[PDB]
RNA sequence: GGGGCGAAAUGGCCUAGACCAUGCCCCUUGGCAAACCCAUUCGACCGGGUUUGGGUCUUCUGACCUCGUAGUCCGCGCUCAGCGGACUUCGACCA
């Protein structure tokens, strides 16, 4: 398991950035929309597009970071490693005599 | 020594990979589920504008 | 799995919900970890006896 | 697979490896009915902070009975079960001569007539 | 720095106690690297109400100082002695060393390095274009509102 | 124009499970428990055009 | 290792043991491309309180396609996947003659022409 | 070390490697006085984001003068210095035939009589 | 590589090139323990505006000690370190006869008995 | 409680500018993996408590098992074990 430490790290410990994406979303792009629900029909003709153009731009700006994260994902499946070794010995006393 | 006979290697497997699962699952319960709940209502649209 | 975030830039009209891709990336990443599975392998190289 | 030959005096019994695993080795004796026979469980592990080791050896053998020889209808049914486990806690950095002397003492205590009487006549060891 | 008391009770020949106080300077990592700077293009024209194309970049980092102190004690074990408070009272025959310590901490030093995300963000062209268009629209709307009191 | 980048954090203390001795005895006395310090900061980069 | 020879009528296929383990035996056919070939999963266990046993046998074979013969770039890609699992629940204390009769009946039902028609023409079994 | 033989027509000159380094290879000609002789600097590198490469080749030769043959006392002194650098910007994913054709065209332009006249008589190239 | 044979009188020592580089040549003696042995650093460069040159030659040798012969645990540890550097500032346009005479004078001063006494008995040179 | 913000949602101010109101962003840390103990149908039944968890030699400095992290030359050969191997460094209950 100590051989997979760096791999697990670069896999998820850096992937938390991806989780950080949904945070800004839930925080701003759906909570700050409390104004659209309170305006009269005379303002929905504009607020809908005002929000759509702002969200599409954010998605477009998100796109490249997703590409970088995908490229980083491929970096984890590179078949590279080393070699392990061992050794074993044994002895057997044959004969002996005084002098 | 060459052509060693069939080896008897034993690997326990089950590395510490379940650890990262607790992170995504915990974070998913804090921002993803509320986002899906809010998006369930008034799912805005898009047009040529 | 060979999916891991579909990526693929795309844009349409009257069918693209802005915040529909946000949940998609996270769902794909979550489903990607459940499919992960190690697969180690070992083979004899060289030896000697003294 | 892995075969073990045991000499009882007039016949030779053969035990075959069935569940080859590192943390649990299960040997089964192949004579006739596989259910309710001779089984052996072996386990090897470490302890604490890489100090010593732990070896466990258990030997089970459940007797079976059958009535198909006289009675119309009775499947082979197990009767009692015997459990004889072990526990070996020998440190790595020890002494080969001391380990050999301990093994010889254990073999002598097993082959002595006092443990046989304690097992058969259920008389406490003390001769 | 730490100050400790080595109150050791003597044997039956007296049964007193010797404080023996000693100080011990201690090492610690460096203090937080505070930052505070300011820059601006050279003055072009004195007029500021109109002013000329300029720029300004300010960066600031700071950590509030806050000291705190910890402490702990302990002593040797004996055979069923019911007096093992900071300074053991009774004396059966042997001595008890005991010990009481109290070290202070400078929280300004026990802070990890600043993350790499603390940098200037990147803005594309479409971002600036949309942000300019929406701002101009809001300004024109605010202007239209003002003309309602003609 | 303008571009900002904020930063905020907190700090706490959590002593170890215990200070085990060899064959002696020890105990814990008075620890922070409450909050400790704080870190902040803010960057800015604005360019104005007529 | 372990080799299994299967006769299809005019050619002989060879399956080689790959993942030798007690609770999961994985045999893989060696002909050409190892990915998307013939695989066989075998498992043997017990049940309940040492009453009967459980044997599982699954055979999978996924077809592959390639365009390097005409198109100037396409790696071998798998198409569909077929799963054919089994389940054997035979108690230990049974009957050898009954087991042989059941095996013969299963072999006859497999070699009959009704199951072949059910597989090919997708017509329900009923002749 | 590394020797380079150049044929001028009637004699052969030998250049020896002196400063063996990856980012800077310095070859010096060994004939007599080492100071003020023939030197060659070679460099190889990449560019941008692993796209193409960059090769630099410079050849210098400074003439020397001496008065010890007639005048009492004058150490060998350098006169003028000539610098002839190069710049090769060839991408990796190119064409071997195109590179060979370009090398042949460069060799023909070097061996032609127009560049020789441009060098000697200082007449602009245009015949 | 590059081998250098040095005759001490009764035995021959061999130094092997380790770090082959133009601006720094590191020769190391191969006898037994590589750490704390005989090392030689050579460097050659220019100066000013291609006037003269600069040659540096340093020879180091650190003694080692070990207690594994009697004490039951002590790694080979270095004791003192000796540094003997040089500095050669000879211009290119010089005289071969003068350089040979200077080298002969240096060799005679090195082989004389006065420098040996100055090194051993630490007596100032003056006989 | 300790902080942040005027950004970001709007309202005063509202060439501009810098401050204000509701108002919005975080901490209340968390995890050990093993071994043993109770009353009883005189164990099946969930829940709790104790001993250990990178480890020893003088775990004082400093080293001896192990690895992790880097930088440097590296072998295209010399050594009985051989081998692919060398030197210097920081860390080592886990996020």
Swiss-Prot record, chain A:
Family: Belongs to the Leviviricetes maturation protein family.
Superkingdom field: Viruses
Annotated compartments: Virion
Part of the full-length chain shown: 152 to 250 of 449
Species of provenance: Pseudomonas phage PP7
Listed name of the protein: Maturation protein A
Subunit structure: Interacts with the host pilus.
Summary of the function given for this chain in its UniProt record: The maturation protein is required for the typical attachment of the phage to the side of the bacterial F-pili. Binds to sequences located toward each end of the genome, hence circularizing it. The RNA genome-maturation protein A complex is released from the capsid upon host receptor binding. Maturation protein A enters the cell along with the viral RNA.
Source species taxonomy: Viruses, Riboviria, Orthornavirae, Lenarviricota, Leviviricetes
From Swiss-Prot, chain C:
Purpose: The maturation protein is required for the typical attachment of the phage to the side of the bacterial F-pili. Binds to sequences located toward each end of the genome, hence circularizing it. The RNA genome-maturation protein A complex is released from the capsid upon host receptor binding. Maturation protein A enters the cell along with the viral RNA.
Disulfide cross-links: none
Name this polypeptide is given: Maturation protein A
Family: Belongs to the Leviviricetes maturation protein family.
Cellular localisation: Virion
Subunit structure: Interacts with the host pilus.
UniProt source species: Pseudomonas phage PP7
Swiss-Prot record, chains D, G, H, I:
Residues reported in the UniProt entry to bind RNA: 39, 45, 52, 54, 58, 60, 83, 85, 89
Cellular compartment(s): Virion
GO molecular function: identical protein binding; RNA binding
Record carries keyword Acyltransferase: no
Key word RNA-binding present: yes
InterPro entries to which the protein is assigned, alphabetical: Phage_PP7_CP (IPR015148), Phage_RNA-type_capsid (IPR015954)
GO BP annotations listed: regulation of translation
UniProt effect for mutating residue 52 to L/P: Loss of translational repressor activity
Classification via Gene3D superfamilies: MS2 Viral Coat Protein
GO CC aspect terms: T=3 icosahedral viral capsid
Phenotype when changing residue 45 to P/S/V: Loss of translational repressor activity
Taxonomic superkingdom: Viruses
Keywords linked to the UniProt accession: Capsid protein, Disulfide bond, RNA-binding, T=3 icosahedral capsid protein, Translation regulation, Virion
Family to which the UniProt record says this protein belongs: Belongs to the Leviviricetes capsid protein family.
Quaternary structure and partners: Homodimer. The dimers in the capsid are covalently linked with disulfide bridges. The homodimers binds to the viral RNA via an operator hairpin, but also to many other RNA sequences in the viral genome; this interaction probably shifts the virus from the replicative to the assembly phase and ensures specific encapsidation of the viral genome.
Role summary: Capsid protein self-assembles to form an icosahedral capsid with a T=3 symmetry, about 26 nm in diameter, and consisting of 89 capsid proteins dimers (178 capsid proteins). Involved in viral genome encapsidation through the interaction between a capsid protein dimer and the multiple packaging signals present in the RNA genome.
Protein name: Capsid protein
Organism expressing this protein natively: Pseudomonas phage PP7
UniProtKB/Swiss-Prot annotation, chain F:
Cystine bridges: none
Residues under site feature: Essential for infectivity: 10
Places the protein is found: Virion
Sequence similarity: Belongs to the Leviviricetes maturation protein family.
Biological role stated in the UniProt entry: The maturation protein is required for the typical attachment of the phage to the side of the bacterial F-pili. Binds to sequences located toward each end of the genome, hence circularizing it. The RNA genome-maturation protein A complex is released from the capsid upon host receptor binding. Maturation protein A enters the cell along with the viral RNA.
SUBUNIT field: Interacts with the host pilus.
UniProt-recorded name of the protein: Maturation protein A
Organism: Pseudomonas phage PP7 (Bacteriophage PP7)
Residues of the full protein shown: 351 to 400 of 449
